[PDB]
Amino acid sequence: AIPTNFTISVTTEILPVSMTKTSVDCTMYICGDSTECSNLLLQYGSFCTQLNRALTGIAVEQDKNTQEVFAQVKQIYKTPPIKDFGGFNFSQILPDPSKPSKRSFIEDLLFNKVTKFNGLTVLPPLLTDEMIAQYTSALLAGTITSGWTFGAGPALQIPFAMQMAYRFNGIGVTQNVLYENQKLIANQFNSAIGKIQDSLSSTPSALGKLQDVVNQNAQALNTLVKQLSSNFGAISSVLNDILSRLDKPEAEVQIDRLITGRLQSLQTYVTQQLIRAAEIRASANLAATKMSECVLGQSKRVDFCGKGYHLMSFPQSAPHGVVFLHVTYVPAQEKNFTTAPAICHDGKAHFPREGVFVSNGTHWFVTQRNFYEPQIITTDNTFVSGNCDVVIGIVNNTVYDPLQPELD
Amino acid sequence: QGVNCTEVPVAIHADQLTPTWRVYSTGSNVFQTRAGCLIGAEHVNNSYECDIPIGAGICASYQTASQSIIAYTMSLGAENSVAYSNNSIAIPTNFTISVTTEILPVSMTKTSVDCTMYICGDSTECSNLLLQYGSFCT
Amino acid sequence: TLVKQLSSNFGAISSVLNDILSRLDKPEAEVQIDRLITGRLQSLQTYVTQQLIRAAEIRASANLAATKMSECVLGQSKRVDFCGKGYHLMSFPQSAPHGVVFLHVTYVPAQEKNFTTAPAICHDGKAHFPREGVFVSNGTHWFVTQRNFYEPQIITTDNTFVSGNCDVVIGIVNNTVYDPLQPELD
Ligand SMILES: CC(=O)N[C@@H]1[C@@H](O)[C@H](O)[C@@H](CO)O[C@H]1O
Ligand SMILES: CC(=O)N[C@@H]1[C@@H](O)[C@H](O)[C@@H](CO)O[C@H]1O
Ligand SMILES: CC(=O)N[C@@H]1[C@@H](O)[C@H](O)[C@@H](CO)O[C@H]1O
Ligand SMILES: CC(=O)N[C@@H]1[C@@H](O)[C@H](O)[C@@H](CO)O[C@H]1O
Ligand SMILES: CC(=O)N[C@@H]1[C@@H](O)[C@H](O)[C@@H](CO)O[C@H]1O
Ligand SMILES: CC(=O)N[C@@H]1[C@@H](O)[C@H](O)[C@@H](CO)O[C@H]1O
Ligand SMILES: CC(=O)N[C@@H]1[C@@H](O)[C@H](O)[C@@H](CO)O[C@H]1O
Ligand SMILES: CC(=O)N[C@@H]1[C@@H](O)[C@H](O)[C@@H](CO)O[C@H]1O
Ligand SMILES: CC(=O)N[C@@H]1[C@@H](O)[C@H](O)[C@@H](CO)O[C@H]1O
Ligand SMILES: CC(=O)N[C@@H]1[C@@H](O)[C@H](O)[C@@H](CO)O[C@H]1O
Ligand SMILES: CC(=O)N[C@@H]1[C@@H](O)[C@H](O)[C@@H](CO)O[C@H]1O
Ligand SMILES: CC(=O)N[C@@H]1[C@@H](O)[C@H](O)[C@@H](CO)O[C@H]1O
Ligand SMILES: CC(=O)N[C@@H]1[C@@H](O)[C@H](O)[C@@H](CO)O[C@H]1O
């Protein structure tokens, strides 16, 4: 069976890259502003210091994760004032310069969809949303105007349609297919992008992978805070109520009960955050890998870039992650043909060159795989190896020699 | 961090702290960023590569911007415009052979701890109590 | 940290087991000792937990290093930026105290020039496409170059192929395709 047509499919892949950079003042969380409590907490040595270091390390990694995924381009590339890309319309994924906050249309959908402390603080990221958008824009500008060349050195300009021709060739489809069907391909592409807008707006769970990270972190903090009122066997969950009621030798006992419980609760929080951090780090490493292999090149890895044969990938920013729009070639409308491994001609076994021998029942042709474009069997598109008593499925036919009519 | 410039951070020196501490309350060198109140750095309207990251796009560095610490919004890289057209192609005429180094950790120090010794040392009484904690040591 | 915690004195009269045992009687020492046991056990559990988490990080790094060894040293990776910037040619491993160092040798396409191009050549009504190359021009003559180096050849029937007529391709330009058989016969 060989496809006679194809479609251009665009799919989205959602990957988390970073977490909220929380930090906890262990002494304040456990002891508040109580001097007596702090004096007892010191008897637990370095536990507080160690917890502070663990959270600090996590917060640092969150910027490292973002940096590795997005800052893969040495220069910030801009698009031309004239967006002529051979019929391919990227206006829904590229920034809109008339509004100095953009973030392209698709990105805006992503940001719109995804949605008072006691020792607890939240640190800002080093890279702001605008800075991330600039990196994304540069990657898109590079991809569109210089293909993958900018990912291996200097950006080398190339007409977009010609870039696509190379991407088609890279999946086993001859360049002529693109140029002959360029309008169809551009239209299939443009429609596929429009569908992405509807897909994201229609499905409320489309970005669940990013929302889950946010929700998990929120729950971890809600639990950490609620534990302050637990009263771990003490007469009261409030340090001030213990201290205002009991004398020193009695309060110390009640306070120690709360310190142990609160320290254990905080250690639990930090441990869970370290485990979650490793999950996010792995995701960020994957996102960074995809950026390099899908956006800055043409991956040949199966289902590493959505289903189908990979052509292109267009990154989009998101609150705590990255979104990849994977453009793939998917075969369509196959027909059944009769085939053979070789043609028997004058006792010689002829094998195809980068193609397959097919038949409609009356005539045999050499056709390229993954598209169907039958050619006459000649000595230019075949090669000879051995006699015809070896190949099992060999069939008898005539191989055309284009020199004959030039001489005779 | 999270502090409003000149409003809040100028509370502590109310206790008359060391002259080399209270200096960090002087104006001009006070810059407000989303990360908090930065005191002692000179804010500039220039841009450079990240050196010492502060947060929210702000970084600091030491310049010799002469013999001082400055604060700035970091650059994301040089601006570049590809000469895209319908028929212009750039093609390399030369090349270089670049050798780069990549460092990867493979292993850690193979430490091991004798739980009983760490906790109880050579004390018999302590070991007898430690046994009440079941398999934790194992 | 694990060692320093031994002197913490987790609510006990002393951080030293011997001083407690040499000072208090049995029923009193047991209480003070239990305070230290709980604190030291908790400190040790903390250490081990952190080591397991850190160990996972190193294991992941080792798995990546092993992957790179196989794909960069024992072969030629085609994965972008998996072997440094540029097009991968070779990788040479070097040992290190607790890790591995890779020297990645890559090809970088320096010194580009601006050429005029086209997707196809129109010759006698036939649309000629390049074979593993691109059609370029210096403004007076068209050539076939290999990508990533620039090495212009004459456009012939040996380095091109024909598909369809010339009313389909958008950017097609008119030129002469050389047929090397002609001078052999005429
Ligand atoms: C050879 C062939 O069937 N081409 C069809 C084209 O006629 C149709 O208009 C288009 C959808 O609009 O889908 C293509 O696959
Ligand atoms: C599906 C799609 O891409 N539609 C775009 C439209 O949004 C844009 O305003 C117009 C500008 O020429 O170009 C079309 O191709
Ligand atoms: C691509 C194609 O034509 N496949 C047909 C299939 O639809 C049909 O059902 C079967 C006979 O049952 O013969 C196959 O060759
Ligand atoms: C079984 C069948 O379809 N045979 C057709 C033949 O009728 C046609 O004349 C020829 C092109 O000229 O192409 C063959 O595939
Ligand atoms: C490629 C080929 O010739 N395959 C033949 C098949 O057509 C035939 O129906 C079958 C009978 O057993 O024997 C196979 O070897
Ligand atoms: C099954 C069949 O047709 N076999 C014939 C064989 O008898 C003939 O000798 C040869 C040409 O020499 O061509 C093969 O196709
Ligand atoms: C650093 C900061 O947020 N300062 C705000 C100031 O911007 C605001 O205008 C004022 C009320 O008018 O209250 C201050 O606390
Ligand atoms: C936005 C801004 O801070 N601009 C300052 C300007 O106020 C100052 O007078 C000048 C002195 O050289 O340096 C510019 O960077
Ligand atoms: C064609 C060309 O420019 N080749 C130059 C060569 O002349 C020069 O000597 C060398 C550096 O020593 O760098 C090469 O790229
Ligand atoms: C490789 C090359 O020659 N690039 C040139 C660029 O230097 C020049 O600035 C631009 C016109 O402004 O035209 C490009 O083709
Ligand atoms: C515009 C231009 O450079 N044209 C030159 C031409 O003068 C030269 O004679 C020919 C080689 O013989 O190569 C062409 O590229
Ligand atoms: C490959 C090609 O011919 N591109 C032409 C371009 O040269 C021309 O300047 C433009 C005018 O709108 O129309 C494009 O189709
Ligand atoms: C813009 C242009 O030059 N078009 C000519 C066309 O008029 C001519 O008919 C054809 C050869 O038949 O060659 C094309 O290059």
Short mmCIF file of N, CA, C and O in Angstrom, two decimals, chain B residues 83 86-109 111-115 118-127 129-130 132-133 136-137, chain C residues 2 6 17 21 33-34 37-38 40-41 44-45 47 55 58 61-62 64-65 68 84 98-117 136 145 148-150:
data_model
loop_
_atom_site.label_atom_id
_atom_site.label_comp_id
_atom_site.label_asym_id
_atom_site.label_seq_id
_atom_site.Cartn_x
_atom_site.Cartn_y
_atom_site.Cartn_z
N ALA B 83 18.49 38.72 6.80
CA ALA B 83 18.09 39.34 5.54
C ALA B 83 17.25 38.39 4.71
O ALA B 83 17.67 37.93 3.65
N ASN B 86 12.55 36.51 -0.84
CA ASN B 86 11.93 35.42 -1.58
C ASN B 86 12.97 34.59 -2.33
O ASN B 86 12.66 33.50 -2.80
N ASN B 87 14.17 35.14 -2.50
CA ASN B 87 15.17 34.47 -3.32
C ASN B 87 16.61 34.68 -2.85
O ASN B 87 17.54 34.42 -3.61
N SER B 88 16.82 35.13 -1.62
CA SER B 88 18.18 35.31 -1.13
C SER B 88 18.59 34.15 -0.25
O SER B 88 17.91 33.83 0.71
N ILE B 89 19.72 33.53 -0.57
CA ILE B 89 20.22 32.44 0.25
C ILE B 89 21.65 32.71 0.68
O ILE B 89 22.48 33.10 -0.14
N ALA B 90 21.94 32.49 1.95
CA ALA B 90 23.32 32.62 2.39
C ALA B 90 23.95 31.24 2.48
O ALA B 90 23.33 30.29 2.95
N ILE B 91 25.18 31.13 1.99
CA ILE B 91 25.88 29.86 2.03
C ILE B 91 27.32 30.08 2.50
O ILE B 91 27.99 30.95 1.96
N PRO B 92 27.80 29.31 3.48
CA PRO B 92 29.13 29.37 4.04
C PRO B 92 30.13 29.02 2.98
O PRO B 92 29.87 28.14 2.17
N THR B 93 31.27 29.69 3.00
CA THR B 93 32.33 29.41 2.04
C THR B 93 33.54 28.82 2.73
O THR B 93 34.48 28.37 2.09
N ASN B 94 33.50 28.82 4.06
CA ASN B 94 34.58 28.31 4.88
C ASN B 94 33.99 27.66 6.11
O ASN B 94 32.78 27.57 6.26
N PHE B 95 34.85 27.16 6.96
CA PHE B 95 34.40 26.52 8.17
C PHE B 95 35.49 26.50 9.20
O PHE B 95 36.66 26.69 8.88
N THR B 96 35.10 26.23 10.43
CA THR B 96 36.07 26.03 11.49
C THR B 96 35.81 24.73 12.21
O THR B 96 34.68 24.22 12.22
N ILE B 97 36.84 24.20 12.84
CA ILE B 97 36.69 23.04 13.68
C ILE B 97 36.75 23.47 15.12
O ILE B 97 37.78 23.91 15.61
N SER B 98 35.62 23.37 15.79
CA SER B 98 35.50 23.83 17.15
C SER B 98 35.54 22.66 18.10
O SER B 98 34.88 21.65 17.88
N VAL B 99 36.32 22.79 19.17
CA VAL B 99 36.34 21.74 20.17
C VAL B 99 35.82 22.30 21.48
O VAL B 99 36.39 23.25 22.03
N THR B 100 34.75 21.72 21.99
CA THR B 100 34.16 22.20 23.22
C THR B 100 34.21 21.13 24.29
O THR B 100 34.29 19.94 23.98
N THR B 101 34.15 21.55 25.54
CA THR B 101 34.25 20.61 26.64
C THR B 101 32.94 20.48 27.40
O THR B 101 32.36 21.48 27.82
N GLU B 102 32.51 19.24 27.60
CA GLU B 102 31.33 18.99 28.41
C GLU B 102 31.67 18.16 29.63
O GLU B 102 32.30 17.11 29.54
N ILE B 103 31.24 18.64 30.79
CA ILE B 103 31.54 18.00 32.06
C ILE B 103 30.29 17.31 32.62
O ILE B 103 29.26 17.96 32.79
N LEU B 104 30.40 16.02 32.93
CA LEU B 104 29.29 15.31 33.56
C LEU B 104 29.77 14.52 34.78
O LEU B 104 30.72 13.76 34.67
N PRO B 105 29.13 14.70 35.94
CA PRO B 105 29.28 13.88 37.12
C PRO B 105 28.82 12.46 36.82
O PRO B 105 27.84 12.26 36.11
N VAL B 106 29.51 11.49 37.39
CA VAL B 106 29.12 10.10 37.24
C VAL B 106 28.87 9.43 38.58
O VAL B 106 27.98 8.59 38.69
N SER B 107 29.67 9.75 39.59
CA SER B 107 29.56 9.04 40.85
C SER B 107 29.81 9.92 42.07
O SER B 107 30.36 11.02 41.96
N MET B 108 29.41 9.42 43.22
CA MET B 108 29.62 10.06 44.51
C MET B 108 30.59 9.26 45.36
O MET B 108 30.90 8.11 45.05
N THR B 109 31.02 9.85 46.46
CA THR B 109 31.81 9.13 47.45
C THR B 109 30.93 8.06 48.10
O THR B 109 29.81 8.34 48.53
N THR B 111 29.93 6.56 50.85
CA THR B 111 29.93 6.62 52.30
C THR B 111 29.06 5.52 52.88
O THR B 111 28.18 4.99 52.20
N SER B 112 29.28 5.22 54.14
CA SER B 112 28.47 4.26 54.87
C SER B 112 28.45 4.63 56.34
O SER B 112 29.44 5.14 56.87
N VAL B 113 27.32 4.42 57.00
CA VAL B 113 27.22 4.79 58.41
C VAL B 113 26.77 3.63 59.28
O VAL B 113 25.78 2.98 59.00
N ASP B 114 27.50 3.43 60.37
CA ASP B 114 27.13 2.48 61.39
C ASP B 114 26.13 3.17 62.30
O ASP B 114 26.50 4.00 63.12
N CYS B 115 24.85 2.89 62.08
CA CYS B 115 23.81 3.63 62.76
C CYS B 115 23.93 3.52 64.27
O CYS B 115 23.84 4.52 64.98
N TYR B 118 26.98 5.57 65.44
CA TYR B 118 26.73 7.00 65.31
C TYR B 118 25.85 7.50 66.45
O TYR B 118 26.13 8.53 67.06
N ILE B 119 24.76 6.78 66.72
CA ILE B 119 23.80 7.19 67.73
C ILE B 119 24.26 6.90 69.15
O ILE B 119 24.14 7.75 70.03
N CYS B 120 24.73 5.68 69.39
CA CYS B 120 25.03 5.21 70.74
C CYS B 120 26.51 5.16 71.10
O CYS B 120 26.86 4.94 72.26
N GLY B 121 27.40 5.31 70.13
CA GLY B 121 28.82 5.16 70.40
C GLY B 121 29.09 3.74 70.89
O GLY B 121 28.67 2.76 70.27
N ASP B 122 29.80 3.63 72.01
CA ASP B 122 30.12 2.34 72.60
C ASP B 122 29.32 2.10 73.88
O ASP B 122 29.70 1.26 74.70
N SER B 123 28.23 2.83 74.04
CA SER B 123 27.40 2.70 75.23
C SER B 123 26.40 1.56 75.15
O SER B 123 25.57 1.51 74.24
N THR B 124 26.49 0.64 76.10
CA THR B 124 25.61 -0.51 76.17
C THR B 124 24.18 -0.09 76.48
O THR B 124 23.23 -0.60 75.89
N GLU B 125 24.04 0.84 77.42
CA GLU B 125 22.72 1.29 77.85
C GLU B 125 21.99 1.93 76.69
O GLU B 125 20.79 1.72 76.49
N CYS B 126 22.72 2.71 75.90
CA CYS B 126 22.12 3.39 74.78
C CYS B 126 21.67 2.39 73.73
O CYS B 126 20.57 2.52 73.19
N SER B 127 22.49 1.38 73.47
CA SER B 127 22.13 0.37 72.49
C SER B 127 20.87 -0.37 72.90
O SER B 127 20.03 -0.69 72.07
N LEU B 129 18.40 0.82 74.52
CA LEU B 129 17.26 1.69 74.24
C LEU B 129 17.02 1.81 72.75
O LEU B 129 15.88 1.86 72.29
N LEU B 130 18.10 1.83 71.97
CA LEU B 130 17.97 1.97 70.53
C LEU B 130 17.20 0.81 69.93
O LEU B 130 16.45 0.99 68.97
N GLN B 132 14.63 -0.45 70.85
CA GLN B 132 13.20 -0.22 70.99
C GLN B 132 12.65 0.49 69.76
O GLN B 132 11.44 0.69 69.63
N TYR B 133 13.54 0.88 68.86
CA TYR B 133 13.15 1.57 67.65
C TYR B 133 13.12 0.61 66.47
O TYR B 133 13.01 1.02 65.31
N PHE B 136 14.61 0.61 62.35
CA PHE B 136 15.04 1.88 61.77
C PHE B 136 16.51 1.86 61.38
O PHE B 136 16.87 2.32 60.30
N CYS B 137 17.37 1.35 62.25
CA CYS B 137 18.79 1.32 61.95
C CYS B 137 19.11 0.43 60.76
O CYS B 137 19.88 0.80 59.88
N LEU C 2 26.08 16.10 59.52
CA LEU C 2 25.76 14.88 60.24
C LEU C 2 26.62 14.76 61.49
O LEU C 2 26.13 14.35 62.55
N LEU C 6 25.94 15.74 66.39
CA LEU C 6 26.23 14.93 67.57
C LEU C 6 26.39 15.78 68.82
O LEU C 6 26.20 15.30 69.93
N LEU C 17 27.01 11.21 75.83
CA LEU C 17 26.34 10.06 76.42
C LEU C 17 27.05 9.63 77.69
O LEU C 17 26.42 9.24 78.67
N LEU C 21 25.53 9.27 81.50
CA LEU C 21 25.59 7.98 82.16
C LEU C 21 26.47 7.99 83.40
O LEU C 21 26.21 7.27 84.36
N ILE C 33 19.01 10.06 77.73
CA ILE C 33 19.56 9.32 76.62
C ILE C 33 18.55 9.20 75.51
O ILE C 33 18.88 9.37 74.34
N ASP C 34 17.30 8.93 75.86
CA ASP C 34 16.26 8.81 74.85
C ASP C 34 16.10 10.11 74.07
O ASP C 34 15.84 10.09 72.86
N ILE C 37 18.82 10.01 71.56
CA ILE C 37 18.59 8.99 70.54
C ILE C 37 17.59 9.48 69.52
O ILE C 37 17.79 9.30 68.32
N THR C 38 16.50 10.08 69.98
CA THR C 38 15.50 10.57 69.05
C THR C 38 16.09 11.62 68.12
O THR C 38 15.87 11.58 66.91
N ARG C 40 19.30 12.19 67.35
CA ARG C 40 20.34 11.66 66.49
C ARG C 40 19.78 10.76 65.41
O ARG C 40 20.24 10.78 64.27
N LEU C 41 18.74 10.00 65.75
CA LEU C 41 18.11 9.15 64.77
C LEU C 41 17.44 10.01 63.70
O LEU C 41 17.55 9.71 62.51
N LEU C 44 20.13 11.44 61.46
CA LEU C 44 20.66 10.44 60.56
C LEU C 44 19.67 10.10 59.45
O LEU C 44 20.06 9.92 58.30
N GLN C 45 18.38 10.04 59.79
CA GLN C 45 17.36 9.78 58.78
C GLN C 45 17.33 10.90 57.76
O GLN C 45 17.15 10.66 56.56
N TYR C 47 19.89 12.79 56.88
CA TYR C 47 21.06 12.60 56.03
C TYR C 47 20.81 11.56 54.96
O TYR C 47 21.08 11.80 53.79
N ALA C 55 21.50 11.00 45.17
CA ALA C 55 21.94 9.85 44.41
C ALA C 55 21.17 9.73 43.11
O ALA C 55 21.73 9.38 42.08
N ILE C 58 22.60 12.08 40.53
CA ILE C 58 23.83 11.55 39.97
C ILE C 58 23.56 10.40 39.04
O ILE C 58 24.19 10.29 37.99
N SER C 61 22.57 11.74 35.80
CA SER C 61 23.74 12.29 35.12
C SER C 61 24.58 11.18 34.52
O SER C 61 25.04 11.29 33.38
N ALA C 62 24.76 10.10 35.27
CA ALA C 62 25.53 8.96 34.79
C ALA C 62 24.86 8.33 33.58
O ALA C 62 25.53 7.92 32.64
N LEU C 64 23.02 9.89 31.43
CA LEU C 64 23.25 10.80 30.32
C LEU C 64 24.66 10.66 29.81
O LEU C 64 24.90 10.66 28.60
N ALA C 65 25.61 10.54 30.73
CA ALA C 65 27.01 10.39 30.35
C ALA C 65 27.21 9.11 29.58
O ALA C 65 27.96 9.08 28.60
N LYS C 68 25.78 9.62 26.10
CA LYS C 68 26.70 10.39 25.28
C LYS C 68 27.90 9.56 24.88
O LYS C 68 28.35 9.63 23.74
N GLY C 84 27.61 19.51 21.80
CA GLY C 84 28.16 20.84 21.63
C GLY C 84 27.48 21.51 20.44
O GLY C 84 26.69 20.89 19.74
N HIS C 98 35.35 12.33 39.69
CA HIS C 98 34.04 11.75 39.94
C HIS C 98 33.12 11.93 38.75
O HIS C 98 31.92 12.13 38.91
N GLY C 99 33.69 11.86 37.56
CA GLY C 99 32.89 12.09 36.37
C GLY C 99 33.67 11.87 35.10
O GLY C 99 34.76 11.30 35.10
N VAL C 100 33.07 12.29 34.00
CA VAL C 100 33.67 12.12 32.68
C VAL C 100 33.67 13.45 31.95
O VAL C 100 32.75 14.26 32.10
N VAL C 101 34.69 13.66 31.15
CA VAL C 101 34.79 14.86 30.35
C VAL C 101 34.81 14.54 28.88
O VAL C 101 35.59 13.70 28.43
N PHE C 102 33.94 15.18 28.11
CA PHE C 102 33.91 14.93 26.68
C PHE C 102 34.41 16.11 25.89
O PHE C 102 33.95 17.24 26.07
N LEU C 103 35.34 15.85 24.98
CA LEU C 103 35.78 16.88 24.07
C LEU C 103 35.07 16.69 22.74
O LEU C 103 35.33 15.72 22.02
N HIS C 104 34.14 17.58 22.44
CA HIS C 104 33.30 17.43 21.26
C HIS C 104 33.86 18.23 20.11
O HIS C 104 34.09 19.43 20.23
N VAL C 105 34.08 17.56 18.99
CA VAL C 105 34.64 18.19 17.80
C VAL C 105 33.52 18.42 16.80
O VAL C 105 32.92 17.46 16.31
N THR C 106 33.23 19.69 16.49
CA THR C 106 32.13 19.98 15.58
C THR C 106 32.54 20.88 14.43
O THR C 106 33.51 21.64 14.51
N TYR C 107 31.77 20.80 13.36
CA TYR C 107 31.95 21.61 12.16
C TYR C 107 31.06 22.85 12.19
O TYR C 107 29.85 22.74 12.36
N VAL C 108 31.67 24.01 12.04
CA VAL C 108 30.93 25.26 12.05
C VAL C 108 31.04 25.99 10.70
O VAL C 108 32.14 26.30 10.26
N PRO C 109 29.92 26.26 10.03
CA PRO C 109 29.82 26.86 8.71
C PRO C 109 30.07 28.36 8.70
O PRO C 109 29.13 29.16 8.67
N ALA C 110 31.34 28.73 8.79
CA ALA C 110 31.77 30.13 8.85
C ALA C 110 31.84 30.81 7.47
O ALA C 110 31.97 30.16 6.43
N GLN C 111 31.81 32.15 7.49
CA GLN C 111 32.02 33.01 6.31
C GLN C 111 31.01 32.82 5.19
O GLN C 111 31.37 32.40 4.09
N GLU C 112 29.75 33.15 5.45
CA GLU C 112 28.72 33.04 4.43
C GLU C 112 28.69 34.21 3.47
O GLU C 112 29.04 35.34 3.82
N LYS C 113 28.22 33.93 2.26
CA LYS C 113 28.00 34.94 1.25
C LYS C 113 26.56 34.92 0.77
O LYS C 113 25.89 33.89 0.87
N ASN C 114 26.10 36.05 0.26
CA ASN C 114 24.74 36.19 -0.25
C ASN C 114 24.61 35.86 -1.73
O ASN C 114 25.20 36.54 -2.57
N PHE C 115 23.83 34.83 -2.04
CA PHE C 115 23.61 34.41 -3.41
C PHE C 115 22.13 34.48 -3.76
O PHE C 115 21.27 34.38 -2.88
N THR C 116 21.82 34.62 -5.04
CA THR C 116 20.44 34.57 -5.49
C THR C 116 20.07 33.12 -5.76
O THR C 116 20.89 32.37 -6.29
N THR C 117 18.87 32.70 -5.38
CA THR C 117 18.49 31.32 -5.60
C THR C 117 17.14 31.13 -6.26
O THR C 117 16.39 32.08 -6.49
N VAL C 136 21.95 28.32 -7.23
CA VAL C 136 22.33 29.67 -6.82
C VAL C 136 22.83 30.48 -8.00
O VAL C 136 23.17 29.93 -9.04
N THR C 145 25.14 24.22 -5.98
CA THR C 145 26.07 24.13 -4.86
C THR C 145 25.61 23.11 -3.85
O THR C 145 24.42 22.90 -3.66
N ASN C 148 25.98 23.92 3.02
CA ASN C 148 26.95 23.96 4.11
C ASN C 148 28.40 24.08 3.66
O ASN C 148 29.31 23.89 4.48
N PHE C 149 28.64 24.43 2.40
CA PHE C 149 30.02 24.69 2.00
C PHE C 149 30.20 25.62 0.79
O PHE C 149 31.21 26.31 0.72
N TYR C 150 29.29 25.59 -0.18
CA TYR C 150 29.42 26.38 -1.41
C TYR C 150 30.50 25.86 -2.34
O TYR C 150 31.68 26.18 -2.19
#
